[model samples]
Target: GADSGEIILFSGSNHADFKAWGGDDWPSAFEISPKYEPMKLDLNKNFEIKVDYNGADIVLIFARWDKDIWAQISPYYVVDGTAVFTKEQIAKAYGSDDFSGLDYIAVKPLPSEEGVTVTKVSGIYTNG
Candidate 1:
């Protein structure tokens, strides 16, 4: 039984002992920093939003309002570099190329196991 890697019983109260015995592999919850810089975008036409961060795990949060309902779009998680999205993509999601009645768009970084650090956020727009 001692030769095998199977762990039958473990004490959760003694965290130090558990960690010392290689129990740190278990997932634990951590607090995410609430502090974030929110950047707005002018989506009157076609646009591209680019974000660069230091951490490997990052999230690109897109916020918008459709009529009376609020919507959020996060294409994917940035593994270790930059994340980019276009207005056409958003338009496609909304089933239209016209980005009208779109109240606004806000972006923020999300926290992960490795944490996150947002370096820069930029936007480019082309009026149609």
Candidate 2:
């Protein structure tokens, strides 16, 4: 049966058709922007790498060593000093080694005297 003044499920955002009946509602909808800031990764006290690879953009690909898994926290980035992680990617890179499979290295940026100062790339491979 249908309710009195409740929002009817007759139509949807895409105007898609529903069956003769339904179970649960679609829940909710949201909007996002594509304009993203740059990314930075501080490996050590004197080394701050920036992932400015073409087509690479900014991503956090979580993975593990000697394990078949992925997550969203492995490949983390700091755009304008804001750490960004993807829940979808987190679901992918969930398990593995810390220093074998998932490599967290980025390109180096030019030195700046202000907030965004470019550091050296020393002892980058000291861990693995």
Candidate 3:
């Protein structure tokens, strides 16, 4: 599945009233939100990032990570759009290993700013 003519965008001031587009996953365009609030998230539990584009900033949250169990064991999230993603964050989901795993891939437009700033999101993996 590719671009499905789906255009989900909006602007708001209240955090509680933040609008969500309900994406399946992240793509390679949007940057890893600098403010990742991972307080009660369950690793190993499949979770999706709920992004709220606030005109100037984006708010990403780990909403659903599978069932209640995963929810209960959910690990902390990265803060500053780019969550700390400490080793503990890895251990919480992935076991100790030298090999690298898919932690969360984020891509931003070249130059970081300017232009329309078109960003795409998805869960597509391109490497081994």
Candidate 4:
């Protein structure tokens, strides 16, 4: 949990190691990251986002609705710096429709009263 706090960052609509999506200050600030490989992730599971900063009011996930269209899912309440979610949480985000392409995930601190440095912004299972 300590190593000069060294982490990875990435740019793009839905790509990164640890986007500037973590902090405790006002206004969330996400920065660009190297083109390094982010761990392979798969949606439709016990999804969760873990942060290093204080807990947030809610964490939001941004995924691609289509080739050229990205969508934001419903917010998942944060508990102890972790936001746990599942497929059911994002159901209403499409409303009677379904999208298959998942591109990116994002975290937000409501009211912009605090900053959110996203340490982990993905949900998936590990083969190991």
> Candidate 1, TM-score vs. the true structure?
0.46
List, residue by residue over 5-50, the lDDT tens digit for candidate 3. 1122222322222223354432223433223532232323333333
Each model's Cα RMSD: 18.1, 22.2, 14.3, 9.6
Ranking by TM-score: 1, 4, 3, 2
Which ranges in model 4 have alpha carbons more than 4 Å from their true place?
1-39, 44-56, 65-77, 96-99, 122-128
lDDT of each: 0.41, 0.27, 0.27, 0.40
**Window of ten residues with lowest summed lDDT in model 3:** 66-75
Per-residue error for 72 in candidate 2, Å, reads 2.4
Residue 106 miss distance in model 2 (angstroms): 10
User: Once superposed on the true structure, which residue ranges of model 1 sit more than 4 Å away at CA?
Assistant: 1-42, 56-71, 75-80
Candidate 1 lDDT over residue span 22-117, tens digit each: 343422111111224222444554566655555433323233343543333454434456566666666665565554544444343343444444
Candidate number achieving the greatest TM-score relative to the actual structure: 1
Tens digit per residue, CA lDDT, model 4, 1-128: 11121122322232122224354442333321113334433333333333433433544545453554434454455566545544446545534234344455455455434434445544443221
Q: Give the candidates in order of lDDT, highest first.
A: 1, 4, 3, 2
Clashes of each: 0, 14, 18, 11
Best by lDDT: 1
